[PDB]
Design a protein around this ligand. Structure first.
Ligand code: LMT
Ligand code: LMT
Ligand code: LMT
Ligand code: LMT
Ligand code: LMT
Ligand code: LMT
Ligand code: LMT
Ligand code: LMT
Ligand code: LMT
Ligand code: LMT
Ligand code: ANP
Ligand code: ANP
Ligand code: MG
Ligand code: MG
Lengths: 634, 634
């Protein structure tokens, strides 16, 4: 080995025109190699067929051009990060060689090699100072670009998923299907945030880049393997251990040590899916037991039952803390193997290359590159076993959403009562039988016809099929049969409930509930509030406090007689609606209904024997199935 | 510089008997230095006086010995981690010297220095193989020891905080205080998990050790500074830049560069507290609007109002996504400074020591130790500015709990009605005036006395002070005055509500609600269910489904007449309770009450004019303030 000076590894001049063609070449290969694996994952996979049923309409259509145009920049922002990782490795090959040429000039004595080794050190520091700004600039323009995507995804998904909950009265007929969902108030608010925001377990924090995401963190660990496998191939040598001549030992060793140590870490973390799904189910049945106590806080204070409610509230907190203690005991046997494997491989490229260095074969430059390339194809093939604890919690957020999407298509396939429009203006019903979900009987087939000015009173016992007749004519009860003829329209058939109801907003929205607040003028709302003796509420039409705990139940049944004078229906049904009003105010509220609307089919359910002298006919339920119709004898 | 062989830095023999005395010496200093800073933080701090009001009783008392004994091991588990970080730095000082003595024997020619440098390399690999098992063993016995602490803290805190919510009827009188809390169903379930589990922002995951916690991550960054400052002190030299002779440049430089760059990163992240407090408030008023729609899903289906409810549900989702977009825009200007500062300091110990190395002053061993000690007192003084985004979200979880603890001591200071026990058996009330929170009047002072067999009917209009008389005798209405004399006891004065109520559990718990299910024998519950005509419910006493949506409101008022035959009260009040029952079943339910309990003061509120011929006296509210008392006629 004669006197050789210092020569660089890569020509640092013409390094920017060469790293502008490699990026443009590696982008178009990966753009058609990524789009051929997701097609193979939409089929042939049980968890890939449930990802596409939820969010299909966001990626296809005419309004899905700005989605792919923003998804195509995040691949350039990963290829540009692999290229800098290679150019950082090319510089430590120069610095450790320049630090070796300076030591062989001091001990030898000459000053030609030393002056060529000193000048090679101050060159390989100025290259580090230019490639340290392009790292900060690339990192900080990558947090901002990936937080504008998982916001606009979440805003679309939680708006599309709610129209699917209240489309065909599917929020009420989900109690009769065979397999029922637990609570759909949590899978819309919280679970969409875990589903859309990349890494599983937690909702997103405003510092999550693209390296903490289970898609773009996996397509980096393939380009980082393909781009590094041409450096480790021509830096290893023949190894003899048992008389077997292995040609490239350090390259075939790392592909055996990972494949064996991976398949043991898939049978340890196998039951880790059904322990992270039960942690969201038992934690969302504890919060519902506290909200139900909040809006019923007067009846608990009346009964003084604050000690029985301290037991049915503690019976739901025991299995949410007994399940967590075995979720902890499984994530130590899983995290104790992936660290004990990765720790006993770090002195391996220092004990194979070290006998080849003390003899004159290599020159201390390629030891500092073998120590980097071996610790970078090992940190990229160990992505599929280091991040299995954050994928098994992401697979338990597709099941919860797929249950909600599945249990609304079986909520619109249950049978109901067929409804047809009338001939001119009539309410006639041909044959109706109503059953009980256990299989009993309530009402035999009956035939009723009303005319344009008729009336009807339905009377009977206290617990025999009286409200569930009206729950069948409103298309809400599945166990029924028959047909109905109605004066159909938009709001030309009004129903009223037995227990009163008030919405959330201001009092102007409480007064006219089925219509909007802007479709009713201001000048007509202050006169109809004085016919129902609701005088002192002419102010306070712009307040915000909750009216379910302020308005007494004798004033929530006079508001319900003001929603019937503004909508102007034709065939209004009503049950109850005089449970709190006394006689004198009850008789004064039906004369107004007969004097304002001159021709409406009024059907009213009642209990007190002072309303039968106002209507014309009468239907009586004997209980057990038998009905009896008779005209008002008067 | 003559021929010198290889000598180690530290005597590796007698390294275990020396590192067993240093740990025992550094434990007792830190045990009394840590306990003198927390005392200075309990006072003199606005966020330290609110931490002690919540969780005081857990750390003091006689049952708080096993808390400190488990808190004292987690300090040993940090001192044992600083000592290994020093012993790892002592080994790179040997390996880089042994790699330098081998290169000065090849170029010089002799084989005495080379054979002494080769043998010094294979010694400093076997020391790395022993100190790599004590790292994995220490890390994996540190996850398990800190997950047994923040479980037993959470189980105690969420049980102590709930007894403070329903102690003195404080769940109802929190609506009348001056500054009201938002929703206390979220600060008990979720916010205790963020408060107890160390690092802020997210609830704990089962892999959080002790280095991801805002207390034991701060007491490591002081012992790591004190233990490393004696190595960097005697490795730096005199630097001349502008004619000023600085004695120790590399030590006084790093204490100036951090103190300046810290105080700029405290005025950028200053409004980051009130943006992480509003993210939990606007996200917990959206979920409440979905639960209220779930248990009232019949009245929305009757009215067909699924389009007005799609607007009052979208008016609460706009400000939860408009606030997040400015939480993202602040966490980039804060994270863009702490990375741009820490990146431009990494080539600094390589450009000051490099002219001193090419001349014969140092020997390449202490460059590899200056590169480590400078990058370890810089990574420990930068703990108070790198982790300010996770502390400003922890300071917004003490305000939410302190509001809940504060708003229950002002909920028991409001005035009420004084109650005294009776003389023998009587209900007499002296003077009672009842007001309205706006300042109006409902009831003038009145004086009523009942005897051991008397009765009373309270009648009046539909909206004039009828239920709020009974909301004052039950100690629930703050705007009242006067006194009351009652036959006091445990359950010798029963109240009933206007709207019925059913608890959560099985039907055996629904039937006997104020008593427990075990305090009533089985043989007496099946006879009293047949006197109230509730015959077919003799089975299904062991089911689980919700009975608020199954039992009709005509059968939730006959169950309420079976809670009055098992408790056996003396002076029972009741309002409503016959809104759905017809005549014939109403008259048959009062004869049973008079025939089973032979002497009870029965006070009943009613509307229908067929109940006044059963009682004896009568009180009538004229409306506006005037009352009128008269004995029952014929
Ligand atoms: C599209 C983005 C591309 C991503 C990858 C980024 C590639 C660019 C990063 C490395 C740039 C290296 O920048 C380097 O600077 C040093 C000076 O400090 C210069 O280095 C060169 O200087 C002069 C030419 O000017 C030569 O005679 C000399 O032999 C050589 O040392 C070159 O200008 C360039 O080789
Ligand atoms: C940063 C967070 C992570 C981001 C997550 C990004 C996920 C992107 C996944 C897209 C993968 C492509 O998904 C693939 O799209 C093509 C269209 O090009 C579909 O091809 C076709 O699908 C069905 C097949 O019946 C057709 O009805 C549809 O018209 C058509 O799109 C494939 O069915 C789908 O599997
Ligand atoms: C992570 C993968 C990154 C590689 C992909 C980057 C794309 C770079 C160019 C962006 C242009 C995207 O533009 C988009 O292309 C896809 C083809 O896939 C077209 O096709 C897409 O929509 C059409 C309907 O419009 C569907 O029938 C089809 O199933 C769907 O794949 C879109 O109509 C077009 O809007
Ligand atoms: C999810 C799967 C995604 C698949 C991703 C596939 C990425 C492909 C890696 C880049 C391939 C580029 O192919 C390469 O191009 C450059 C420019 O000529 C040349 O090779 C260049 O990159 C390779 C890295 O592979 C270097 O080892 C080599 O020093 C360099 O000159 C060769 O011609 C060819 O090996
Ligand atoms: C429609 C396209 C859907 C793409 C949505 C985005 C997902 C991005 C890819 C997920 C990354 C997971 O990374 C790795 O994936 C492979 C499968 O490829 C999983 O490997 C396994 O997954 C599960 C869990 O055992 C097995 O049922 C499956 O048979 C096997 O493929 C690894 O457990 C996971 O660590
Ligand atoms: C309480 C826990 C303490 C925490 C800190 C941990 C301290 C222990 C870690 C370092 C232990 C070093 O272990 C080291 O092993 C090498 C062999 O490989 C030995 O090293 C020594 O060997 C023999 C003595 O046996 C000597 O003549 C020789 O000069 C020297 O190289 C010593 O046995 C010990 O110095
Ligand atoms: C891993 C998660 C993080 C773990 C968090 C650990 C926090 C531990 C904090 C404890 C600090 C000591 O806190 C200090 O205790 C001493 C008792 O020794 C108290 O000293 C005294 O406090 C008040 C003073 O009026 C007395 O009523 C009380 O009897 C007494 O304890 C101090 O008031 C308190 O400030
Ligand atoms: C993070 C700090 C770690 C350093 C502390 C490690 C302690 C090592 C020995 C553990 C013994 C602890 O034992 C505990 O000591 C404290 C003194 O602080 C005593 O004092 C504690 O409780 C008593 C009442 O019992 C209170 O009046 C007092 O305010 C409180 O500090 C406890 O009564 C005792 O149970
Ligand atoms: C929240 C605040 C907590 C404060 C924590 C305070 C920790 C104190 C650090 C350890 C102090 C030990 O004090 C030290 O003891 C050992 C054993 O003799 C000796 O010094 C030993 O440790 C020091 C580290 O400081 C080394 O630089 C030295 O090589 C070693 O011999 C000296 O005598 C004395 O400097
Ligand atoms: C009763 C004992 C309470 C101990 C509970 C456990 C808390 C553990 C210590 C908190 C760690 C925070 O670490 C660092 O603390 C210092 C104060 O010491 C904070 O410094 C500042 O805090 C806030 C925020 O500006 C200022 O109002 C305060 O004036 C100042 O001290 C830093 O913002 C924080 O990064
Ligand atoms: N915060 C409030 N809580 C209760 N009532 C309030 C409140 N603010 C104002 N009020 C009025 O106070 C009165 C109390 O009504 P209340 O005496 O309970 O009715 P009632 O006579 O029991 N009704 P009814 O059941 O129909 O016979 C009503 O006029 C309310 O509108
Ligand atoms: N899932 C169910 N939903 C409704 N009713 C059910 C259900 N399962 C059983 N039933 C019984 O079916 C009957 C329906 O009661 P319903 O006809 O609504 O009462 P009502 O006659 O309106 N009562 P009332 O208001 O006092 O006059 C009752 O006997 C219920 O106990
Ligand atoms: Mg009914
Ligand atoms: Mg009332």
């Amino acid at each position: 080995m004669g006197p050789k000076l210092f020569k660089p590894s890569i020509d640092w001049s013409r390094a920017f025109p060469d790293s502008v063609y490699w990026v443009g070449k590696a982008w178009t290969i990966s753009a058609i190699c990524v789009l051929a694996i997701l097609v193979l994952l939409r089929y042939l996979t049980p968890w890939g067929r449930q990802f596409w049923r939820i969010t299909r309409a966001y990626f296809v259509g005419p309004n899905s051009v700005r989605v792919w145009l923003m998804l195509g920049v995040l691949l350039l922002s990963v290829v540009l990060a692999v290229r800098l990782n290679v150019l950082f490795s090319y510089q430590g090959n120069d610095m450790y060689t320049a630090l070796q040429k300076a030591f062989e000039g001091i001990a030898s004595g000459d000053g030609t090699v030393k002056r060529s080794g000193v000048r090679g050190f101050w060159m390989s520091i100025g290259v580090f100072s230019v490639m340290a700004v392009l790292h900060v600039t690339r990192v900080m323009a990558d947090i901002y670009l990936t937080q504008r995507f998982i916001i606009a995804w979440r805003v679309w998904l939680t708006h599309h998923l709610t129209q699917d909950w209240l489309d065909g009265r599917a929020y009420y007929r989900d109690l009769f299907i065979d397999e029922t969902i637990d609570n759909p108030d949590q899978r819309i608010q919280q679970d969409v945030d875990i589903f859309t925001a990349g890494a599983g377990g937690t909702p997103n924090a405003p510092s999550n880049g693209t390296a903490s995401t289970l898609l773009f963190g996996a397509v980096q660990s393939i380009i980082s393997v393909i781009s590094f496998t041409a450096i480790l191939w021509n830096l290893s040598g023949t190894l003899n251990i048992f008389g077997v001549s292995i040609p490239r030992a350090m390259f075939w060793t790392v592909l055996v040590y990972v494949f064996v140590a991976t398949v043991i870490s898939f049978i340890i973390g196998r039951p880790l899916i059904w322990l992270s799904f039960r942690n969201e189910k038992l934690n969302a049945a504890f919060r519902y037991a506290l909200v139900r106590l909040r809006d019923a806080a007067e009846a608990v204070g009346f009964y003084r039952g604050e000690r029985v409610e301290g037991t049915q509230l503690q019976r739901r907190f025991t299995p949410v803390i007994d399940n967590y203690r075995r979720y902890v005991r499984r994530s130590i046997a899983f995290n104790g193997w992936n660290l004990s494997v990765s720790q006993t491989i770090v002195p391996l490229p220092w004990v194979i290359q070290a006998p080849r260095l003390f003899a004159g074969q290599i020159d201390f430059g390629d030891v500092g590159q073998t120590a980097t390339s071996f610790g970078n194809i090992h940190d990229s093939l160990s992505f599929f076993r280091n991040n299995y604890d954050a994928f098994a919690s992401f697979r338990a957020a597709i099941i919860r959403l797929h249950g909600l999407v599945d249990a609304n298509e079986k909520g619109r396939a249950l049978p109901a009562v067929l409804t047809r429009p009338s001939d001119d203006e009539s309410v006639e019903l041909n044959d109706i039988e109503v059953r009980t979900p256990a299989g009993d009987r309530l009402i035999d087939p009956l035939d009723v016809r009303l005319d344009r000015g008729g009336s009807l009173v339905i009377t009977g016992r206290s617990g025999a099929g009286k409200t569930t007749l009206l729950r069948s004519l409103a298309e809400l009860w599945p166990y029924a049969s028959g047909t109905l003829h109605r004066p159909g329209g938009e709001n030309e058939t009004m129903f009223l409930s037995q227990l009163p109801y008030v919405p959330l907003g201001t009092l102007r929205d409480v007064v006219c509930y089925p219509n909007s607040a802007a479709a009713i003028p201001d000048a007509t709302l202050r006169d109809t509030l004085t016919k129902v003796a609701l005088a002192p509420l002419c102010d306070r039409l712009d307040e915000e406090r909750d009216w379910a705990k302020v308005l007494s139940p004798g004033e929530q049944q006079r508001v319900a007689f003001a929603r019937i004078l503004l909508t102007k229906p034709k065939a209004v049904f009503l049950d109850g609606s005089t449970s709190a009003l006394d006689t004198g105010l009850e008789f004064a509220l039906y004369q107004l209904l007969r004097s304002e609307l001159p021709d409406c089919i009024v059907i009213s359910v009642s209990h007190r024997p002072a309303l039968e002298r106002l209507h014309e006919n009468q239907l009586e339920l004997l209980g057990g199935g038998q009905w009896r119709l008779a005209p008002v004898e008067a």
